[PDB]
Amino acid sequence: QAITRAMADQARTIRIPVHMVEVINKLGRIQRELLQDLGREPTPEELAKEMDITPEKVLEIQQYAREPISLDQTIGDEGDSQLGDFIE
Protein backbone atom coordinates (compact mmCIF):
# COMPACT_ATOMS: atom_id res chain seq x y z
CA GLN A 1 0.00 0.00 0.00
CA ALA A 2 2.78 2.45 0.87
CA ILE A 3 4.76 1.75 -2.30
CA THR A 4 1.77 2.05 -4.65
CA ARG A 5 0.36 5.12 -2.86
CA ALA A 6 3.69 6.94 -2.98
CA MET A 7 4.28 5.94 -6.60
CA ALA A 8 0.93 7.53 -7.46
CA ASP A 9 1.79 10.62 -5.42
CA GLN A 10 5.30 11.13 -6.77
CA ALA A 11 5.77 9.45 -10.15
CA ARG A 12 4.45 12.35 -12.24
CA THR A 13 5.40 15.97 -12.85
CA ILE A 14 1.89 17.41 -12.95
CA ARG A 15 0.46 15.48 -10.03
CA ILE A 16 -2.64 13.38 -10.69
CA PRO A 17 -4.60 12.24 -7.61
CA VAL A 18 -4.87 8.64 -6.53
CA HIS A 19 -8.43 7.97 -7.71
CA MET A 20 -7.73 9.28 -11.20
CA VAL A 21 -4.54 7.20 -11.25
CA GLU A 22 -6.71 4.20 -10.32
CA VAL A 23 -9.10 4.80 -13.20
CA ILE A 24 -6.20 5.42 -15.62
CA ASN A 25 -4.65 2.07 -14.66
CA LYS A 26 -8.03 0.34 -14.94
CA LEU A 27 -8.57 1.85 -18.40
CA GLY A 28 -5.11 0.70 -19.45
CA ARG A 29 -5.69 -2.89 -18.32
CA ILE A 30 -9.13 -2.95 -19.97
CA GLN A 31 -7.69 -1.58 -23.22
CA ARG A 32 -4.85 -4.12 -23.22
CA GLU A 33 -7.13 -7.10 -22.52
CA LEU A 34 -9.54 -5.95 -25.23
CA LEU A 35 -6.71 -5.37 -27.73
CA GLN A 36 -5.42 -8.90 -27.17
CA ASP A 37 -8.81 -10.49 -27.90
CA LEU A 38 -9.88 -8.22 -30.77
CA GLY A 39 -6.69 -8.24 -32.82
CA ARG A 40 -7.15 -4.48 -33.19
CA GLU A 41 -7.07 -1.33 -31.11
CA PRO A 42 -10.44 -0.88 -29.36
CA THR A 43 -12.54 2.16 -30.13
CA PRO A 44 -13.59 4.68 -27.45
CA GLU A 45 -17.16 3.37 -27.79
CA GLU A 46 -16.07 -0.19 -26.97
CA LEU A 47 -13.91 1.01 -24.08
CA ALA A 48 -16.76 3.17 -22.76
CA LYS A 49 -19.33 0.37 -22.90
CA GLU A 50 -16.82 -1.94 -21.22
CA MET A 51 -15.98 0.41 -18.34
CA ASP A 52 -19.59 1.68 -17.87
CA ILE A 53 -18.81 5.33 -18.64
CA THR A 54 -19.24 7.76 -21.52
CA PRO A 55 -16.85 8.10 -24.49
CA GLU A 56 -16.37 11.75 -23.51
CA LYS A 57 -15.18 10.55 -20.10
CA VAL A 58 -12.84 8.05 -21.79
CA LEU A 59 -11.41 10.87 -23.92
CA GLU A 60 -10.94 13.05 -20.83
CA ILE A 61 -9.09 10.26 -19.01
CA GLN A 62 -6.83 9.63 -22.01
CA GLN A 63 -6.28 13.39 -22.15
CA TYR A 64 -5.19 13.56 -18.50
CA ALA A 65 -2.90 10.53 -18.86
CA ARG A 66 -0.20 12.36 -20.89
CA GLU A 67 3.35 13.08 -19.56
CA PRO A 68 5.25 16.21 -20.62
CA ILE A 69 8.13 16.11 -23.07
CA SER A 70 11.37 17.89 -22.16
CA LEU A 71 12.70 21.23 -23.37
CA ASP A 72 16.29 20.00 -23.30
CA GLN A 73 16.43 17.14 -25.78
CA THR A 74 18.30 17.89 -28.98
CA ILE A 75 15.58 17.76 -31.63
CA GLY A 76 18.26 18.44 -34.21
CA ASP A 77 19.82 15.01 -34.66
CA GLU A 78 23.20 16.63 -35.35
CA GLY A 79 23.11 17.84 -31.74
CA ASP A 80 23.59 21.50 -32.67
CA SER A 81 20.18 22.68 -31.40
CA GLN A 82 17.67 21.78 -28.70
CA LEU A 83 13.89 21.94 -28.61
CA GLY A 84 13.68 24.95 -26.28
CA ASP A 85 14.99 27.27 -28.99
CA PHE A 86 12.18 26.42 -31.46
CA ILE A 87 9.22 27.78 -29.49
CA GLU A 88 7.58 31.11 -30.27
Add this chain to the structure above:
DNA sequence: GGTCAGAAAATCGGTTGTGGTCAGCTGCTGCCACCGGTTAACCTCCAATTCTGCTGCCAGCCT
Protein backbone atom coordinates in the same frame (compact mmCIF):
# COMPACT_ATOMS: atom_id res chain seq x y z
C1' DG B 1 -51.14 104.49 -33.63
C1' DG B 2 -47.51 102.89 -29.41
C1' DT B 3 -46.97 100.16 -24.25
C1' DC B 4 -48.03 96.26 -21.32
C1' DA B 5 -50.08 91.29 -19.82
C1' DG B 6 -50.48 86.49 -21.98
C1' DA B 7 -49.25 82.63 -25.15
C1' DA B 8 -46.14 79.97 -27.23
C1' DA B 9 -41.57 78.17 -28.73
C1' DA B 10 -37.16 75.35 -27.37
C1' DT B 11 -33.78 74.79 -23.26
C1' DC B 12 -31.38 73.39 -19.07
C1' DG B 13 -32.61 70.92 -15.59
C1' DG B 14 -35.15 68.53 -11.46
C1' DT B 15 -38.85 64.88 -10.53
C1' DT B 16 -40.48 60.80 -10.85
C1' DG B 17 -42.11 56.65 -11.79
C1' DT B 18 -42.19 52.51 -12.55
C1' DG B 19 -40.52 48.76 -15.39
C1' DG B 20 -37.70 45.84 -15.89
C1' DT B 21 -32.75 44.28 -15.28
C1' DC B 22 -28.72 42.48 -13.84
C1' DA B 23 -25.97 41.09 -10.32
C1' DG B 24 -24.74 40.08 -5.50
C1' DC B 25 -24.72 37.22 -2.88
C1' DT B 26 -27.21 33.54 0.01
C1' DG B 27 -28.63 29.51 1.32
C1' DC B 28 -28.50 25.33 0.19
C1' DT B 29 -28.56 21.29 -1.63
C1' DG B 30 -26.98 17.83 -3.89
C1' DC B 31 -22.92 16.00 -5.43
C1' DC B 32 -18.22 15.21 -6.58
C1' DA B 33 -13.41 15.56 -5.89
C1' DC B 34 -9.98 14.63 -2.80
C1' DC B 35 -7.52 12.93 1.33
C1' DG B 36 -6.83 9.42 4.86
C1' DG B 37 -7.14 4.66 6.87
C1' DT B 38 -7.38 -0.67 6.16
C1' DT B 39 -6.75 -5.77 4.05
C1' DA B 40 -4.13 -11.36 9.01
C1' DA B 41 -2.61 -19.17 4.80
C1' DC B 42 2.41 -18.36 3.00
C1' DC B 43 6.83 -16.47 -0.19
C1' DT B 44 13.00 -12.11 3.81
C1' DC B 45 19.60 -9.21 0.10
C1' DC B 46 20.04 -5.09 -7.17
C1' DA B 47 19.85 -3.60 -14.11
C1' DA B 48 38.90 8.25 -29.74
C1' DT B 49 42.99 10.77 -29.21
C1' DT B 50 46.09 14.28 -26.90
C1' DC B 51 47.81 16.61 -23.01
C1' DT B 52 48.34 17.83 -18.01
C1' DG B 53 48.31 17.10 -13.46
C1' DC B 54 47.70 13.90 -9.21
C1' DT B 55 48.38 9.95 -6.43
C1' DG B 56 49.80 5.51 -5.37
C1' DC B 57 53.94 2.34 -5.32
C1' DC B 58 58.26 -0.06 -5.10
C1' DA B 59 63.56 -0.29 -5.13
C1' DG B 60 67.19 1.63 -2.59
C1' DC B 61 71.21 4.87 -0.30
C1' DC B 62 71.23 6.76 4.42
C1' DT B 63 70.78 7.04 9.11
